[PDB]
Amino acid sequence: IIGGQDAAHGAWPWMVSLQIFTYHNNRRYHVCGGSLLNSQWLLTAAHCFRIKKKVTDWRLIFGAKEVEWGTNKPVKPPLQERYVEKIIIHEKYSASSEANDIALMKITPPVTCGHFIGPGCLPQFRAGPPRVPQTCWVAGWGFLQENARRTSPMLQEARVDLIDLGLCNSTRWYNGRIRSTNVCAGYPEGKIDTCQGDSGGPLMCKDSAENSYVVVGITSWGVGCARAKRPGVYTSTWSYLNWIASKIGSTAVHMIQLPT
């Protein structure tokens, strides 16, 4: 995340740091973000798995504020580290268009919730695409500068405005590459935006208005990071509720949707 601020410990307890584990030396590197749905499942981006497709390629890190690049040590209470049981990539995912950039990871053993770890909410079946105008938030340990050499050790957060898909898809913006299952967010002039390392993480808007946030988007792609008229392109979670329910059960979906 470029141009944002350090998140407070506990600010986004559903954040998960998805880390590549280099098995030759037991080191781990934050690569992508994800959002915790329940003790056994988190939501993230399919494209994060294009190269590391094996459950053994990853460690999953929960309740973190800071993550340590390259560490070979396990985490400390209250953080939790878990293995991946299964990676479920949408059957219609296409890397060339980034269409249906969404996946599920099954966590093992099950995570335990508490002060720094907890599920996010998904949109209601009735919600539809998120509406402009709104000010929403993203979070993640992605690059702090387009050209950074490493992800950010401290979790970042930033407010970003939703951008209407027609504007986002227009001639001098993404000019045809935006799909109806996308959401775009950021600012016409850029300067604030998600970047590499934040993929898979949430785009969250505050219901209306409980005091609870909804993950309405999943960080997917952009051209560069923080460039003018090249905002963050996200996968709309609402577009995949049936798909998610089909992998984890309607009951698990209903449990993380706010009261009718």
Binding site: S39, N211, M255
Partner: peptide, 14 residues
């Protein structure tokens, strides 16, 4: 079953 309950809540610590 610690993960059931009210979704989307921040700062569960307080």
């Amino acid at each position: 079953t610690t993960c059931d309950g009210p979704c989307g809540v921040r700062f569960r610590q307080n």
